[PDB]
Amino acid sequence: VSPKTYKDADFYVAPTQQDVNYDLVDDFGANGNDTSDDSNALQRAINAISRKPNGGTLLIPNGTYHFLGIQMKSNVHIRVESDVIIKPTWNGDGKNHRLFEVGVNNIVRNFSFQGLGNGFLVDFKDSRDKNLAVFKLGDVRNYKISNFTIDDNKTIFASILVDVTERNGRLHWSRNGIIERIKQNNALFGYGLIQTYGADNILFRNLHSEGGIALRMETDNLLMKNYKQGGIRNIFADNIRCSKGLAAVMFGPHFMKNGDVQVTNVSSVSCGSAVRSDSGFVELFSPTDEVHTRQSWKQAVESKLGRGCAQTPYARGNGGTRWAARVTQKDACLDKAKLEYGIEPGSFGTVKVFDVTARFGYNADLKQDQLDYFSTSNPMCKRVCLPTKEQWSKQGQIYIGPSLAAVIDTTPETSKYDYDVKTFNVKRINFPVNSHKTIDTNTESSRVCNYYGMSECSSSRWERLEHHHHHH
């Protein structure tokens, strides 16, 4: 079997007309030389540009800029010179920030943002703000974002949120685009370069995440739960790479029913696996006017579903009055929950991954529920470490240690909502004897690691100091 082919114009069509072309410093008064905020300048430039029926280009010239919460607009095409450094402007209000928002609070049509030459840098290393994404996308169509390195500091926040937004009683999200030639350094395990929530006809290409997951197809979030709208469809990716992370490519549908995805050329070095699949699952949320306790919400649920059909309900945020519970993964329970609440576990349609190469290493991101898969090849749990509380205060959520497999697949969960990640020409390099090529639901495991008394990771290892950057 052969992969499906395509051309860049299938996703993104560049402008044929242009009314204006400006320079961020010369025309708008950005200062590339001090540490002042350049947000106003950038936005004034963007605004002036979208004013014109055919828009135009704005050049961001060499220098160091500070931007935050900028609002993109239709028919603006930003070009960024290769010695630019972009930094998040400081904001101490403790909320979730992004450098750039595309179709989040408006509607955006023909838009691009491109590094020239060898690419530029977004730098988070000196930021005091932990809550940062580079781009958040909503209602945007026909776009290209392209060319740069993100120097992260394990912030909370996939860097690029291919996300939904809410306008006039429905959800909206991005249709045709390309996101390509981006490297991320020093990402947090539970995050990475791309996270997708709602997406039609998007090409993801030449993307690399150091840590976490490069292409996270984990389709979750409030608005989609509530509106029963969103998810991803007809996604193409090529050249997805992981280093010192969980996975290059990950499928995790949650509650959303997703479309088709095709991936070619997946590589990883020193990651959990090159490809990862999770089963879908259902959470039932208690009503927002009823006052509930954990035990009362479990009871409402076991009442309609059965003894044993609810998992341990957790708290909705702070408050303590609103509750959510996972339906147990048993066809029976899942069946009644379908009949009774009209909702089921999520899945993906046709999924094909071509050319997967996983190179063994010693510094993968590892989840605690994966450690027992070392039983066959690493029966003394060598080279696995626990991060200190200063490094990560919820000890046991993340470990650093040897690669486990080419492909991890937890999808066999359930009967009716199972989905099929087809993989082709899968290779491993330098895995030890008795190790796993695929890990699934049936794979034999057995505790060999000290979960909470094993030795702790050096600062050097946690902070990836051995990696001297050369994007310079």
Please say which residue, 30 or 217, places its beta carbon nearer to Ca ion.
30
Under rule CB under 5 A, residue 152 binds Ni ion: no
Report the partner that residue 139 touches, choosing among Ca ion, Ni ion, none (CB closer than 5 to 8 A by kind): none
CB of 36 to Ca ion, least distance (A): 4
In angstroms, what is the minimal distance from the CB of 472 to Ni ion? 7
Number of residues that bind Ca ion (CB under 5 A): 3
Q: What span, in angstroms and rounded, lies between the C-alpha atoms of 440 and 396?
A: 22
365 binds, among Ni ion, Ca ion, none (CB under 5 to 8 A by kind): none
Sequence-distant (6+) residues with CB within 8 A of 414 are 279, 280, 329, 331, 334, 345
Looking at the Cβ atoms of 24 and 102, the one nearer to Ca ion is: 24
> Given the complex with Ca ion, which of 25 and 426 has the nearer CB atom?
25
Q: Of residues 433-472, which lie at the interface with Ni ion (CB under 5 A)?
A: 469
Which among Ni ion, Ca ion, none contacts residue 38 (Cβ within 5 to 8 A by kind)? Ca ion
Query: Which residues fall within 8 angstroms of residue 207, CB to CB, at 6 or more apart?
Result: 179, 180, 181, 182, 183, 193, 194, 214, 215, 237, 239, 240, 241
Q: Which residues contact 22 (CB under 8 A, 6 or more apart)?
A: 28, 45, 48, 49, 56, 57, 58, 59
If one asks whether residue 86 binds Ca ion (CB under 5 A), the answer comes out as: no
Nearest-5° Cα angle at 247, 245 to 250? 145
What is the distance, to the nearest Å, from the Cα of residue 271 to the centroid of all Cα atoms in its chain?
16
Q: Rounded to the nearest 10 degrees, how much is the dihedral formed by the CA atoms of 384, 439, 196, 258?
A: -160
Quick check: 151 binds Ni ion (CB under 5 A)? yes
**Spatial distance between the Cα atoms of 91 and 451, rounded to a whole number of angstroms:** 38
CB of 61 to Ca ion, least distance (A): 12
Min dist CB 370 to Ca ion, Å, is 45
Taking the complex as a whole, the smallest distance from the CB of residue 348 to Ni ion amounts, in Å, to: 35
CB of 185 to Ni ion, least distance (A): 6
243 token code pair: 């280093």
User: CB neighbours (10 Å) of residue 14?
Assistant: 11
Nearer to Ca ion, 36 or 430 (CB): 36
Based on CB atoms, which residue is closest to Ni ion, 51 or 467?
467
Going by C-alpha positions, the residue among 84, 86, 89 that lies closest to residue 36 is: 89
**36: partner contacted, choices Ni ion, Ca ion, none (Cβ within 5-8 A by kind):** Ca ion
Which of Ni ion, Ca ion, none has residue 151 at its interface (CB below 5 to 8 Å by kind)? Ni ion
Residue 469 partner contact from Ca ion, Ni ion, none using kind-dependent CB cut-offs of 5 to 8 Å:
Ni ion
Whose Cβ is closer to Ca ion: residue 33's or residue 168's? 33
The Cα–Cα gap between 197 and 183 comes to 21
Q: How far apart are CA 241 and CA 182, in angstroms?
A: 11
Residues 351-370 that bind Ca ion (CB under 5 A): none
**85 versus 116: smaller Cβ distance to Ni ion:** 85
Binding mask 32-71 for Ca ion (x = CB under 5 A): ----x-x---------------------------------
**Cβ 121 to Ni ion shortest distance, Å:** 7
What is the number of H-type helices and E-type strands within the chain? 6, 31
Cβ proximity of 239 and 214 under 8 Å: no
Find the length of the chain: 472
Beta carbon nearer to Ni ion, 28 or 191: 191
- Choose, by CB under 5 A, the member of 3, 20, 22, 31 that binds Ca ion: 31
Measure the CA–CA gap between 99 and 404, rounded to whole angstroms.
Answer: 36
User: What is the closest distance, in whole angstroms, from the C-beta atom of residue 85 to Ni ion in the complex?
Assistant: 10
Q: Which residue is nearest to Ni ion (CB)?
A: 469
The tokens for 240 are 């997805």
Looking at the Cβ atoms of 31 and 229, the one nearer to Ca ion is 31
Binding site for Ni ion (CB under 5 A): 151, 469
Binding site for Ca ion (CB under 5 A): 31, 36, 38
